[PDB]
Design an enzyme around this catalytic site. Structure first.
Site, mmCIF file in Angstrom:
data_model
loop_
_atom_site.group_PDB
_atom_site.id
_atom_site.type_symbol
_atom_site.label_atom_id
_atom_site.label_comp_id
_atom_site.label_asym_id
_atom_site.label_seq_id
_atom_site.Cartn_x
_atom_site.Cartn_y
_atom_site.Cartn_z
ATOM 1 N N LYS A 87 -8.241 -5.031 -4.463
ATOM 2 C CA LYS A 87 -8.071 -4.738 -6.067
ATOM 3 C C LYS A 87 -7.605 -5.974 -6.776
ATOM 4 O O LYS A 87 -6.668 -5.919 -7.707
ATOM 5 C CB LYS A 87 -7.083 -3.543 -6.228
ATOM 6 C CG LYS A 87 -7.449 -2.353 -5.564
ATOM 7 C CD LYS A 87 -6.304 -1.208 -5.552
ATOM 8 C CE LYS A 87 -6.655 -0.224 -4.319
ATOM 9 N NZ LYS A 87 -5.421 0.506 -4.406
ATOM 10 N N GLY A 130 -8.537 5.668 -1.019
ATOM 11 C CA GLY A 130 -8.323 6.667 0.127
ATOM 12 C C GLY A 130 -8.216 6.087 1.508
ATOM 13 O O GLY A 130 -8.605 6.836 2.583
ATOM 14 N N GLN A 132 -11.176 -4.002 -1.481
ATOM 15 C CA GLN A 132 -10.177 -3.246 -1.102
ATOM 16 C C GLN A 132 -8.744 -3.586 -1.866
ATOM 17 O O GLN A 132 -8.003 -2.667 -2.401
ATOM 18 C CB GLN A 132 -9.930 -2.958 0.268
ATOM 19 C CG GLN A 132 -9.374 -1.657 0.930
ATOM 20 C CD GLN A 132 -8.116 -1.162 0.260
ATOM 21 O OE1 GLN A 132 -8.285 -0.722 -0.909
ATOM 22 N NE2 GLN A 132 -7.032 -1.504 1.078
ATOM 23 N N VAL A 179 -2.924 3.847 3.407
ATOM 24 C CA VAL A 179 -1.851 4.051 4.321
ATOM 25 C C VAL A 179 -2.658 4.443 5.616
ATOM 26 O O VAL A 179 -1.834 3.871 6.521
ATOM 27 C CB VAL A 179 -0.954 5.255 3.916
ATOM 28 C CG1 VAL A 179 -1.500 6.462 4.186
ATOM 29 C CG2 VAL A 179 0.525 5.174 4.787
ATOM 30 N N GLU A 217 0.842 -1.188 -0.032
ATOM 31 C CA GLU A 217 0.005 -0.062 -0.197
ATOM 32 C C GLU A 217 0.833 1.266 0.015
ATOM 33 O O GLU A 217 0.679 2.165 -0.804
ATOM 34 C CB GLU A 217 -0.910 -0.089 1.100
ATOM 35 C CG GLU A 217 -2.010 -1.146 1.158
ATOM 36 C CD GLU A 217 -3.299 -0.754 0.166
ATOM 37 O OE1 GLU A 217 -4.310 -1.521 0.071
ATOM 38 O OE2 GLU A 217 -2.946 0.503 -0.434
ATOM 39 N N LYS A 229 -6.783 11.446 -4.432
ATOM 40 C CA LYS A 229 -7.118 10.736 -5.570
ATOM 41 C C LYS A 229 -8.765 10.636 -5.957
ATOM 42 O O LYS A 229 -9.103 9.609 -6.771
ATOM 43 C CB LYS A 229 -6.283 9.276 -5.707
ATOM 44 C CG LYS A 229 -4.922 9.447 -5.466
ATOM 45 C CD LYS A 229 -4.251 8.342 -4.956
ATOM 46 C CE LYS A 229 -2.850 8.371 -4.562
ATOM 47 N NZ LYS A 229 -1.808 7.206 -4.093
ATOM 48 N N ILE A 258 -4.759 12.156 6.383
ATOM 49 C CA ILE A 258 -4.482 10.999 5.556
ATOM 50 C C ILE A 258 -3.894 9.899 6.612
ATOM 51 O O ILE A 258 -4.688 8.620 6.330
ATOM 52 C CB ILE A 258 -3.512 11.239 4.820
ATOM 53 C CG1 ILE A 258 -3.833 12.232 3.632
ATOM 54 C CG2 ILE A 258 -2.418 9.952 4.190
ATOM 55 C CD1 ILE A 258 -2.691 12.994 2.785
ATOM 56 N N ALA A 293 -9.936 9.409 2.772
ATOM 57 C CA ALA A 293 -9.426 10.680 2.515
ATOM 58 C C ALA A 293 -8.292 10.541 1.702
ATOM 59 O O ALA A 293 -7.335 9.742 1.966
ATOM 60 C CB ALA A 293 -8.984 11.202 4.005
HETATM 61 N N1 LIG Z 1 4.352 9.135 -0.658
HETATM 62 C C1 LIG Z 1 3.595 10.052 -0.863
HETATM 63 N N2 LIG Z 1 3.427 11.269 -1.325
HETATM 64 C C2 LIG Z 1 2.523 12.157 -1.639
HETATM 65 N N3 LIG Z 1 1.377 12.092 -1.341
HETATM 66 C C3 LIG Z 1 1.103 10.788 -0.609
HETATM 67 C C4 LIG Z 1 1.770 9.708 -0.252
HETATM 68 N N4 LIG Z 1 1.370 8.624 0.108
HETATM 69 C C5 LIG Z 1 0.043 9.175 0.310
HETATM 70 N N5 LIG Z 1 -0.230 10.293 -0.291
HETATM 71 C C6 LIG Z 1 -1.280 11.093 0.154
HETATM 72 O O1 LIG Z 1 -2.299 10.604 0.936
HETATM 73 C C7 LIG Z 1 -3.331 10.297 0.333
HETATM 74 C C8 LIG Z 1 -4.225 9.051 0.956
HETATM 75 O O2 LIG Z 1 -3.661 7.824 0.707
HETATM 76 P P1 LIG Z 1 -4.148 6.638 1.166
HETATM 77 O O3 LIG Z 1 -4.738 6.628 2.352
HETATM 78 O O4 LIG Z 1 -3.258 5.514 0.664
HETATM 79 O O5 LIG Z 1 -5.106 6.416 0.042
HETATM 80 P P2 LIG Z 1 -5.173 6.663 -1.662
HETATM 81 O O6 LIG Z 1 -3.901 6.095 -2.059
HETATM 82 O O7 LIG Z 1 -6.124 5.765 -2.038
HETATM 83 O O8 LIG Z 1 -5.367 7.984 -1.806
HETATM 84 C C9 LIG Z 1 -3.164 10.062 -1.300
HETATM 85 O O9 LIG Z 1 -4.347 10.267 -2.029
HETATM 86 C C10 LIG Z 1 -2.158 11.298 -1.454
HETATM 87 O O10 LIG Z 1 -2.788 12.155 -1.579
#
Ligand SMILES: Nc1ncnc2c1ncn2[C@@H]1O[C@H](COP(=O)(O)OP(=O)(O)O)[C@@H](O)[C@H]1O
Ligand SMILES: Nc1ncnc2c1ncn2[C@@H]1O[C@H](COP(=O)(O)OP(=O)(O)O)[C@@H](O)[C@H]1O
Ligand SMILES: [Mg+2]
EC number: 5.6.2.2
Lengths: 390, 390
Positions: free
Chosen positions: B334, B114, B332, B117, B39, B100, B91, B97
């Site tokens: 995919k 979203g 989730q 992470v 992820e 994307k 995030i 959240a």
């Molecule tokens: N390494 C990274 N660099 C920049 N932005 C990041 C990074 N990891 C995560 N993000 C931001 O955090 C958001 C949330 O991530 P996540 O919870 O993984 O969901 P998703 O990836 O589906 O958007 C991402 O959409 C992005 O905007």
């Protein structure tokens, strides 16, 4: 410009509407559409499992909505001590809210995630909720997930139970947009086999069709039904039901003379299209048990090694139904059980009782081991013929 | 007593801790454990797809944590306009959240939900976040998803990027609790093939092992790699990359003299173990185009064989990589692509370009038709041997 204002939060049911797939599965081939009905039905079935519900009615209405009526306890109506609205409304509008996160209200249940009916609400243009409880009829209407008014008492009643009727969103489901009688019927028939003593009716107000499922023989009768238009090669269906170490394992199987393998797996009445740890325990047990049988019955070195277990499953119809506190599935739709303790529960029980069965039914044993040896010889002829063309 | 106090709301990351399976997959066989790392890697890869990241380092630490360092834009650190804490904390702590849900920050990305992470955070006993952005280093520590203090500046820097280090929860993951170098290696190697120009390093601080993947040949080179210990039967790898109607379709394939079928499907660089609409489009186009060629050129009549799709795909190695805005998946994790328009995209591009390929490379074509005839002969011989044996 990527910055803090580019980070969007999807609040409440918005997330379900944005990414329905991770909640409901395939929104285009009709399977997610019917999954909507299955989530509501599973809630009723969970009331039956708990011993509170004996009667379920599933109706396909002529405007393509579906309602599910049960005579269970009724969704709680009281003000939720933290959310400030009725618990029913909490349940409809908040993800991961429910009574199945401990074992106080349901000893065992299929719902598990606390999202089922809220997902249905999120993905419905309208939802009508009627709850009979504590001598009162409570009503509430949702439009795209939003309650139109507080849950309200509109009349008296001596019944208990829940009616949920929902109109699926036009935007969310594409391609297959109309409920299919037979998909609902297959599922509700298997639920009737799984739940003796629960009456399950299905009514189609579009064409007047209906069904009443109330099978009594349990999963034995289920295996019998599944073999109806096939030819069983042995008369005694293997069956057992045990509960050990908190895990219930129930199995029924029977071979036919066909060459297909049909093993239906369930966990707290939820089907696993992709199997998982119950199916793994089943397969291991079958293979070990048949090998032990063929060794103690003095079959040749080569005839026993011949027999692979993929040979043993040719012609096989089997139902494996487990009852588990806190099962783990690898997706919201619960297609695969990934609880590793269930593998050893099924495998141990099945090793023991299937051994017994083969001892107690020598005629069935000889017949089936014969089928297995035949399947193996077929597989071997095919292999050699393949190498000959090379 | 079943009433409003039985209804529990699991707030934020608590839901993920209670029901990890629907978010991370199998917590018992090691796959969900490694998905935790994927992820975080996929987030870095999304920064690469958007053009902002050229360097990713994955480290397995000696305490069984894993870190992922990229040199992208850095997770935004500014206070979120509605949530009132840094976007980074939003995030990490809020499901659904991210950046994307529109195409302002990433044109095409694999994250989608979203949740990635924040699921990793939820299922980690500890997570360390270090962000280099706008001349400053920002650090935050989480424990079981709960921040220990707000995101804070710790120093100055001239770089941009994100470092996430996480220590998986001992309670969540069972049986396979240690990261396996090889699982991470296979995935990262594949990502290097899919993302030319992105340096990907893997370090194992437990035993000093490391790797540096920086392949430039793209998915052609990927197929070459997958075939290197096999025996390719024709020298010209079929390859194309197109974009039509907003859908990118990239394909490379080559047959070997084996009898296995290995088709690797990706959507926005996320692998689909269970295939889906890209795989369906691929299969249909392949079968149709090869049967078309074999009929017009007369091979079917001369060898009198009637080839099937299974015959076509014996000995096949293929990579199908699609790039789509807002793909749809059925979980989730995919595993299966269920966007219906993608089937058509792939099928049409394959029919066209594969036809052209067989015309422009007649030697390859003749070798491949030969393999297909052979496979069909083996199949029919096997069928007759089995049919007789009964
Ligand atoms: N390494 C990274 N660099 C920049 N932005 C990041 C990074 N990891 C995560 N993000 C931001 O955090 C958001 C949330 O991530 P996540 O919870 O993984 O969901 P998703 O990836 O589906 O958007 C991402 O959409 C992005 O905007
Ligand atoms: N038909 C019903 N009868 C009684 N209680 C119900 C019914 N449907 C839902 N509930 C209650 O609502 C809760 C939330 O349902 P849901 O959001 O489907 O999540 P889950 O079923 O996983 O808990 C259930 O756990 C149960 O407490
Ligand atoms: Mg439910």
């Amino acid at each position: 410009s990527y910055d803090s204002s580019s980070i969007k939060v999807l609040k409440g049911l918005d997330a379900v509407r944005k990414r329905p797939g991770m909640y409901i599965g395939d929104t285009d081939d009709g399977t997610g559409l019917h999954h909507m009905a299955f989530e509501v039905v599973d809630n009723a079935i969970d009331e039956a499992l708990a011993g509170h519900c004996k009667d379920i009615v599933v109706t396909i209405h002529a405007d393509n909505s579906v309602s599910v009526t049960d005579d269970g306890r009724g969704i709680p109506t009281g003000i939720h001590p933290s959310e400030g609205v009725s618990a029913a409304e909490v349940i409809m509008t908040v993800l991961h809210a429910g009574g199945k996160f401990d074992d106080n209200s349901y000893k065992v249940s299929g719902g598990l995630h606390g999202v089922g009916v809220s997902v249905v609400n999120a993905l419905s243009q309208k939802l009508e909720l009627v709850i009979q409880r504590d001598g009162k009829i409570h009503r509430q209407i949702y439009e795209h997930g939003v309650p139109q008014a507080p849950l309200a008492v509109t009349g008296d009643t001596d019944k208990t139970g829940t009616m949920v009727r929902f109109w699926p969103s036009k935007s969310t489901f594409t391609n297959v947009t109309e409920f299919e009688y037979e998909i609902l019927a297959k599922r509700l028939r298997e639920l009737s086999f799984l739940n003796s003593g629960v009456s399950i009716r299905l009514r189609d107000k579009r064409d007047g069709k209906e069904d009443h499922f109330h099978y009594e023989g349990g999963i034995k009768a289920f295996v019998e039904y599944l073999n109806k238009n096939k030819t069983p090669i042995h008369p005694n269906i293997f069956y057992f039901s045990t509960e050990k170490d908190g895990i219930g394992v129930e199995v029924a199987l029977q071979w036919n003379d066909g060459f297909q393998e049909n093993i239906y797996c369930f966990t707290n009445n939820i089907p696993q299209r992709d199997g998982g740890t119950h199916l793994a325990g089943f397969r291991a047990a079958m293979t070990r048990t048949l090998n032990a049988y063929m060794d103690k019955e003095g079959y040749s070195k080569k005839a026993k090694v011949s027999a692979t277990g993929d040979d043993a499953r040719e012609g096989l119809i089997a139902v494996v139904s487990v009852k588990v506190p806190d099962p783990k599935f690898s997706s919201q739709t619960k297609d695969k059980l990934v609880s590793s303790e269930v593998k050893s529960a099924v495998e141990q029980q099945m090793n023991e009782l299937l051994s017994e069965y083969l001892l107690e039914n020598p005629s069935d044993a000889k017949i089936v081991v014969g089928k297995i040896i035949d399947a193996a010889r077929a597989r071997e002829a095919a292999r050699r013929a393949r190498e000959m063309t090379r």
